[PDB]
Amino acid sequence: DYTVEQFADLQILRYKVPEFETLTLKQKELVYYLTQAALEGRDILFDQNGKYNLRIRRMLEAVYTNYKGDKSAPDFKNMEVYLKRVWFSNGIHHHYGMEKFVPGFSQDFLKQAVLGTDAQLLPLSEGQTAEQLSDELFPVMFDPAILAKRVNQADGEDLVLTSASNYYDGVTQQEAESFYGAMKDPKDETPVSYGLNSRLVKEDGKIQEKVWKVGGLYTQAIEKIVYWLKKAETVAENDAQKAVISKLIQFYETGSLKDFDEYAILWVKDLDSRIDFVNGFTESYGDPLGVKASWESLVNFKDLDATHRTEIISSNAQWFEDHSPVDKSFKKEKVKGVSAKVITAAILAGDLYPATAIGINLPNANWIRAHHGSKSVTIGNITDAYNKAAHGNGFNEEFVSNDEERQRIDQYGDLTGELHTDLHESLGHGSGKLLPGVDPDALKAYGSTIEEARADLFGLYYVADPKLVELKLVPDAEAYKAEYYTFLMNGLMTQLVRIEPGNNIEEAHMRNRQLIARWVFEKGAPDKVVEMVKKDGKTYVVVNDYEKVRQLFGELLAEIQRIKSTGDFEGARTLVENYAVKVDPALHAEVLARYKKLNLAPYKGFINPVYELVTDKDGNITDVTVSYNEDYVEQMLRYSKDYSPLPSVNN
Ligand SMILES: [Zn+2]
């Protein structure tokens, strides 16, 4: 059963760990130790998303598990949904829309609930009462004007002070850009990531950094991570993988950002190990300035059979770059060579739990990828969990135009959808090269939208190529039409189920899909390439010429590749704001009404399996078992009890 529970706008799913039982005992132990190092870092993300998140959580968790009143009352059920969303979003803000949750319960209820809870169980400071803890946390929860956005990206506002994230403390956005612009090296051909694993604070009167390391900030959790990484080091598969674990331990112990670059080099060079993992401060989407990286972790092992399709996409990387529809001046003379593979996720943690991604391209250091290479991974068991949970839910029966399209989607939608993700992560982000002297940050806050659009267009253009039929990546030349329809139907229409009524598209991913869909829709109107007809009051997206759709994909890819490589900022502003922002209220209200009858949640998340060490009668380890019988509430409460080593307050 891939469906666990559904609440609010969130749906909890499960995923299997296929072929885990076939691993050796030394591999199962290495997986176990890496998964343990992953789970210990859950508290690190909560504190990064807000200085009150660890206190608001442990307060609600103490009230939830010790509530004495009627547990079937609307006040308790609405508090239960609130706590579940804080668990899902690793904070009090929406994981996708960045807006703060609105409590569906009164303050008088929570006040009497806190006072009715044992004061010893609440996250009280030294010599603090439950009243003082309520007076400080209630305005954070109930006042809509306090910490309204976890990540702000509005013009004319101090993005550091208007963001509820806890990456800066007592520092203005002007003082942060000047702080790193100064330590910005000039003639440095291998620039370190500056301020990646630290909190920029103003202790006393100086502007300094509190590095996240052993003996420093977040040391209570990092000591646990290093402990399990040392255990994983003793059962490493080979010396290349062992050096990766050892160098990562040094990065945690010293906080040296130079060791992180050395770790990223060794991690890229470890291509032959079956078991791989990510554990550290990786992606910087949580920072409004984009400099600090949130903590995430992923433990996986190579999917041997599924990797052979992604190794054909990699061995033909020069073919896809040469036959690209972009201008010849933007094509790379020789591809950098990306090591692409399909992985089976063993566990999720940090910013990858419970809401995770299906494809990751690392490292982020631009110079490390050029001189040493990158690793592109596709998570097969998560994509499989998405499909089998959505199989037969009747979402396509409601929004697809005709039954003849549904039959093609049911046959090739999973394959071409999974194959499009392979092209996106392994070749979409890596392909193309900027013109000499063009600022890589010339698109400003439009780079994230244009980059994902450029990668989606690369996957869409080539998933239809007749070479993938020659390379036996698709069973026939009609398979791409399933992915083309679902992408257009989602961008033009069905993705609005994730939008609040009266709002526009704000998130970067949802923007590039609508940008690609509406651009092809407008430019294909004279030939009726894509239509949006209505039948009995229901609007359907109709595709009439799938070949012309591909040509329009190439034209938009050539124009987007030109905008990125030449740094045309105002050109990207025209594209993103004219196609990827406006939402039709009449269509949006129609889609929501049709969607509500399906009883589906637009956002998905996964709960991790449960790994157990099997010991003999004398203490030695004989097996490592994996279970899938735990539920959402049980797992979050267990992680809060056994994998929560950080204090409630970290300033
Ligand atoms: Zn991507």
Residue numbers in the entry: 25 to 675
Provide excerpts from the study.
DPP III (EC 3.4.14.4; earlier names: dipeptidyl arylamidase III, dipeptidyl aminopeptidase III) is a cytosolic zinc-metallopeptidase of the M49 family. This exopeptidase catalyses the hydrolysis of the penultimate peptide bond of its oligopeptide substrates with unsubstituted N-termini, thereby sequentially removing N-terminal dipeptides. Despite a low sequence identity (17–21%), the overall structure of BtDPP III is very similar to the previously reported crystal structures of human and yeast DPP III and consists of two domains separated by a wide cleft. The catalytic zinc ion is positioned in the lower part of the upper structural domain, coordinated by His448, His453, and Glu476.
To verify if this conformational change is also characteristic for bacterial DPP III, we crystallized the Cys-null variant in the presence of the competitive inhibitor Tyr-Phe-NHOH. The solved crystal structure revealed that the protein is in the closed conformation. We succeeded in growing only one crystal in the presence of Tyr-Phe-NHOH. This crystal belonged to space group P21212, with two protein molecules in the asymmetric unit. The structure was solved at 3.3 Å resolution using molecular replacement, with the separated structural domains of the Cys-null protein as a model. In contrast to ligand-free bacterial DPP III (open form), in the presence of the inhibitor, the closed conformation was obtained, with the binding cleft closed. According to the DynDom program, this conformational change can be described by a 28° rotation of one structural domain relative to the other. Compared to the human enzyme, a smaller rotation of domains (28° vs. 57°) was observed in BtDPP III in the closed conformation. The zinc ion in the active site is coordinated by His448, His453 and Glu476, as in the open form. Instead of the two water molecules coordinated to the zinc ion in the ligand-free structure, in the closed form we observed a large undefined electron density. As the resolution of the structure in the closed form is only 3.3 Å, and the electron density is not well-defined, we cannot determine the source of the observed electron density near the zinc ion.
